[PDB]
Design a protein around this nucleic acid. Structure first.
Length: 357
DNA sequence: AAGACTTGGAC
DNA sequence: TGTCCAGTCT
């Protein structure tokens, strides 16, 4: 069992920060800084501690914003950890809102030592159009860290940050940023593009599908981004997504018994596949349940049935029992559960069962 | 496999 | 308010 993550900002590390700060700034009020930062340290969460380091430095350094930035630039390469150095972008977000230009410059430099993904989002919150333009430039920088910030900082649903409602509502705003990055060599950037697109599929699935259906997947970097961008839709058995990742059959007697169950009971899916081809076919056969979720909407999950060869004009009966019970990773909600049968990524039929209260 | 499991924050 | 994140494990 690992130590809680707030212990990254423990007193040892505060002392490390004050030591390095004194090396960069001999007149540094190290004692005042440690006193400020330790007050109530125990009851502070990990992100509260990152902020405290920034506030404690600001409270004891008697220099102005540019002069402090000079010391902070020298401090950055001396910190052990990229996580620890989140307080440097945080410092910009706290104290750089009167000097936009210098702040952008400072974020662009600080992000290479850790990440300005959290700090840029305050600027996107309260100064969106100006900040978005900076990022569009950052998406064409030579530094993969800067390019990555362009993608990561503007995500609709960044973990450990508030959602960007403006971005979440309109995927056209950040579209050109992602377009400039859709063939990036950097794995670090490519993850960010994909995770950003994944976020978009939570609210504009059809928009993402069309974008990627316009892409040249001959390019391996682009292909990588597409697979991981579409990963949620894939797991839902989205037909268009499955086509993007890569059958002469008919189906008989598709059914789900019983038609109504209580939680804890079993269902049984069955059908017969028949080939209409003159030669054997490699088939991948899956099914998806539109599970009823908290909202009362459906969210589809795909299970594997069978991957096999069906001879010319042949038949294969398929049967699967599933135990419908609440588990650690899935809670069930009552209502109508549609069940689709997929053959080679195409929906071939649907049945349903009802799960009651 | 499909599910258990991993930080802890947002919703 | 269980799920997700972004995978590792069986």
């Amino acid at each position: 069992a690992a130590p809680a993550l707030k212990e990254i900002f423990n007193v040892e590390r505060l002392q490390h920060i004050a030591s390095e700060m004194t090396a960069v700034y001999p007149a540094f009020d190290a004692k005042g800084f440690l006193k400020h930062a330790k007050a109530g340290l125990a009851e502070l969460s990990v992100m509260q501690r990152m902020a405290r380091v920034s506030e404690s430095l600001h409270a004891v350094i008697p220099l102005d914003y540019p002069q402090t930035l000079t010391l902070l630039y020298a401090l950055a390469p001396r910190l052990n950890s990229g996580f620890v150095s989140l307080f440097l972008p945080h410092y910009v977000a706290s104290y750089g809102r009167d000097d936009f230009k210098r702040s952008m410059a400072a974020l662009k430099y600080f992000t290479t030592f850790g990440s300005a993904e959290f700090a840029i989002r305050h600027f996107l919150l309260h100064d969106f159009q100006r900040t978005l333009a900076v990022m569009q430039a950052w998406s064409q920088d030579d530094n993969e860290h800067v390019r990555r910030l362009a993608s990561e900082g503007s995500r609709p649903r960044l973990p450990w940050s508030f959602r960007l409602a403006e971005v979440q509502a309109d995927p056209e705003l950040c579209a050109s940023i992602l377009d400039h990055l859709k063939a990036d060599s950097s794995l670090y950037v490519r993850k960010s593009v994909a995770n950003h697109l994944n976020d978009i599929t939570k609210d504009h699935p059809e928009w993402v599908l069309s974008l990627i259906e316009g892409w040249n997947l001959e390019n391996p970097h682009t292909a990588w981004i597409a697979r991981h961008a579409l990963r949620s839709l894939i797991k839902q058995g989205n037909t268009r997504a499955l086509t993007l990742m890569g059958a002469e059959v008919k189906i008989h007697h598709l059914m789900v018994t019983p038609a109504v169950i209580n939680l804890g009971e079993r269902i049984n899916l069955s059908f017969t596949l028949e080939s209409t081809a003159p030669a054997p076919q490699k088939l991948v056969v899956d099914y998806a349940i539109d599970y009823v979720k908290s909202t009362g909407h459906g969210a589809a999950k795909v299970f594997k049935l069978k991957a096999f060869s069906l001879g010319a004009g042949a038949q294969q009966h398929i049967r699967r029992e599933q135990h419908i019970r609440d588990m650690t990773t899935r809670k069930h909600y009552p209502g109508r559960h549609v069940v689709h049968v997929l053959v080679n990524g195409e929906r071939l039929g649907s049945a349903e069962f009802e799960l009651r209260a």
